[PDB]
Structure 1
């Protein structure tokens, strides 16, 4: 439900940060690489969050931008990676580096990580390297921003990636509103 927090840094205890928001102190778990970018206690901070429901707990994982959160979200969707390990992966390396490692396929580096499997490492690379394709953004892009947006949305709707791809690509060009595109796409399909 919670995607972002805006408040004052009350305490820092890596990798935990306590952010006061209107009297409510929220504990946020952040990968060290994000952690380094946090402002000083007493100052205002903005963090992108990912909520994790768990058996005996409700947790928030935070990032400095939406790109890093996406990467995190992506990592955890795999069978072998959970939030805790995802946090460790992004504490040893930055989103950027991680992305490079995968592209350059360097398991070596990945293994140097606790709980990090080899067959796991290998599988990871393979898997992630694949997921980045359908991923657009500075991070995941070493075409059209709105089209790519309209697509994601259409895919969020239930349309098979390729279907969607086709559905917007048929009608299109700029000075459209992904919103407009999405809109159009739908009419022309139902």
Structure 2
């Protein structure tokens, strides 16, 4: 419902912030990595925010980039992950580091973050392995298909013949020979 604020840092204190917007200063909590990048009190700062909406109390959580807020929304949409758990997470590691650790299924790099046990690593890897894949049927097979089409095979029959056996680590000329020798 809220995406970003242009205000003035009326007061900083770990780990929250006060952003005086037209006389109105909002309680905004930020991670330590963001806190390091912030200028002094009274400076306009670029925080892209998301509000956590709970029945008894809300939470304003801003970030210097859209990507941080979006990944925090992904982390809070998770089953057993709360907000300040993920705040500790990107306080410990950056977006590229976390993304590469997920793609490498790394646990040792991220268990240094406090509050993270083995089951924390298990749940974060199992969710983030398939929630996002790219973060911001072969050339030899096609040559074989074209060669068998020129040899008289139908394109469907050539596709079936080249998909009949899983040729690996072999040249285009020899893979046709081993596929043609395969079924026969």
After TM superposition, the score normalised by the length of structure 2 is 0.69
Alignment correspondent of 2:85: 85
Structure 1 unaligned spans of 5+? 142-190
What is the SS of the residue equivalent to 2:7? strand
Alpha-carbon distance in 1 for matches of 2:58, 2:124: 27
Alpha-carbon distance in 2 for matches of 1:34, 1:98: 16
| 1:1-27 CA distance string (max 9 Å, x none) | 221111111111122111110000011
Residues 48 and 64 in structure 1, CA contact (< 8 A), matched pair in contact too: yes
Q: Shift of the alpha carbon at 1:129?
A: 2.2
Alignment correspondent of 1:109: 109
What is the SS of the residue equivalent to 1:114? coil
Alpha-carbon distance in 2 for matches of 1:99, 1:92: 13
Residues 39 and 45 in structure 1, CA contact (< 8 A), matched pair in contact too: yes
What is the SS of the residue equivalent to 1:110? coil
Larger Rg: 2
Residues 80 and 120 in structure 1, CA contact (< 8 A), matched pair in contact too: no
Superposed counterparts of 1:1-190, under 5 Å: 1-133=1-133, 140-141=135-136
Alpha-carbon distance in 1 for matches of 2:96, 2:40: 24
| 1:119-178 CA distance string (max 9 Å, x none) | 231221132122122x6xxxx23xxxxxxxxxxxxxxxxxxxxxxxxxxxxxxxxxxxxx
Alpha-carbon distance in 1 for matches of 2:14, 2:130: 32
Residues 9 and 41 in structure 1, CA contact (< 8 A), matched pair in contact too: yes
Structure 2 unaligned spans of 5+? 137-184
Q: Shift of the alpha carbon at 1:114?
A: 2.9
Alpha-carbon distance in 2 for matches of 1:92, 1:79: 21
| 1:82-110 CA distance string (max 9 Å, x none) | 10101111111122211222122111122
**Alignment: residue pair count:** 136
Residues 93 and 110 in structure 2, CA contact (< 8 A), matched pair in contact too: no
Q: Shift of the alpha carbon at 1:54?
A: 2.2
* Residue range with higher mean Cα deviation, 117-126 or 26-35: 117-126
